[PDB]
Amino acid sequence: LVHVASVEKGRSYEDFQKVYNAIALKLREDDEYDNYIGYGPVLVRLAWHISGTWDKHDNTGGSYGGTYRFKKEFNDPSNAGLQNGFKFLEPIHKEFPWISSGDLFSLGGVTAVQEMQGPKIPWRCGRVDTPEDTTPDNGRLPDADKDAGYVRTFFQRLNMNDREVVALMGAHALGKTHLKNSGYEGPGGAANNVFTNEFYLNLLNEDWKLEKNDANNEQWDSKSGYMMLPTDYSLIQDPKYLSIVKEYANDQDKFFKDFSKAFEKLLENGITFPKDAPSPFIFKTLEEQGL
Numbered sequence: 368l369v370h371v372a373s374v375e376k377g378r379s380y381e382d383f384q385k386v387y388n389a390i391a392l393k394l395r396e397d398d399e400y401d402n403y404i405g406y407g408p409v410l411v412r413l414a415w416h417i418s419g420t421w422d423k424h425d426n427t428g429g430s431y432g433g434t435y436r437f438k439k440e441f442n443d444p445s446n447a448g449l450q451n452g453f454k455f456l457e458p459i460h461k462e463f464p465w466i467s468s469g470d471l472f473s474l475g476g477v478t479a480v481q482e483m484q485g486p487k488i489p490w491r492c493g494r495v496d497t498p499e500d501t502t503p504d505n506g507r508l509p510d511a512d513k514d515a516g517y518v519r520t521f522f523q524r525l526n527m528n529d530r531e532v533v534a535l536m537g538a539h540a541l542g543k544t545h546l547k548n549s550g551y552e553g554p555g556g557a558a559n560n561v562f563t564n565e566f567y568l569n570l571l572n573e574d575w576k577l578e579k580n581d582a583n584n585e586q587w588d589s590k591s592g593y594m595m596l597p598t599d600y601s602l603i604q605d606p607k608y609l610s611i612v613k614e615y616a617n618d619q620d621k622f623f624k625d626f627s628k629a630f631e632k633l634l635e636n637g638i639t640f641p642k643d644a645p646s647p648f649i650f651k652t653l654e655e656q657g658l
């Protein structure tokens with residue numbers, strides 16, 4: 368496969384800025400969701416899930432085709448709970464029907480991050496909806512009960528190195544796990560709706576205990592009442608991972624820079640941008656626009 372990016376006919380920056388602004392305004396208004404967490408975390412997770420199905424070997428999956436919209440991918444067990452992000456975006460799509468799906472789903476994750484005070488994430492338009500048949504089978508998303516080796520190996524399929532893996536996982540500071548969705552329960556820190564390097568600090572500073580949960584799965588629990596999945600814990604078991612965790616616990620900036628690049632790469636994987644495509648856009652937050 369070759370997935371060339373094709374800009375939505377006749378739209379420019381300003382058009383995209385408006386879709387961004389609509390998502391952002393709705394994030395603000397629907398602040399009750401998940402006990403006051405808001406939808407930010409879930410959008411972030413949706414954007415990662417539609418992008419994580421990519422396979423560097425044959426170029427299948429990835430954000431391109433917006434296949435999440437199809438039954439198969441939508442009903443993927445690893446996708447349980449994402450339907451709420453979907454439902455949240457639907458009205459937006461209805462208002463701006465010329466945006467493709469992969470573009471919409473991906474822009475929500477970007478909007479979410481920047482609106483939760485994260486770093487700016489450059490973003491490119493151009494994804495094109497593909498047919499139901501381009502939909503990847505389930506089982507391409509990672510399990511949570513493994514270790515560092517597993518994680519290393521898995522991410523490799525997406526071309527991500529150690530530094531990218533560690534940066535990207537710091538998104539685990541957002542939201543929380545939900546029993547019903549994944550068989551895991553609890554938040555990972557205190558600031559679960561603001562973007563910070565809290566994840567790294569908690570892994571390093573808490574006194575984690577391994578326990579089973581009501582779903583009969585193991586998780587690392589802290590006295591403060593926080594949790595970490597085995598895959599998150601594994602970041603401190605591997606020596607290479609561990610020094611990067613340390614770097615981030617110590618420098619929020621470094622982390623923000625690295626996350627930003629890694630997030631973009633993740634969202635751009637498998638897509639070919641012609642020389643004449645426009646440069647990546649950098650959207651203003653509602654606040655920078657005084658809205």
Ligand code: HEM
Nearest residue numbers: 408411412415448510511535538541542543544545548549
């Ligand atoms: C080894 C890799 C990964 C594993 C196994 C993992 C597993 C999961 C699971 C089990 C959940 C909770 C689902 C629920 O019960 O609602 C979680 C939530 C979430 N994940 Fe990951 N995921 C990983 C990587 C990623 C990365 C790369 C990102 C984004 C960069 C992502 C962002 C999030 C967010 C923001 C949430 C919270 C969702 C909410 O509050 O509803 N995770 N992840």
Ligand SMILES: [N+]
Nearest residue numbers: 539541542543
């Ligand atoms: N989380």
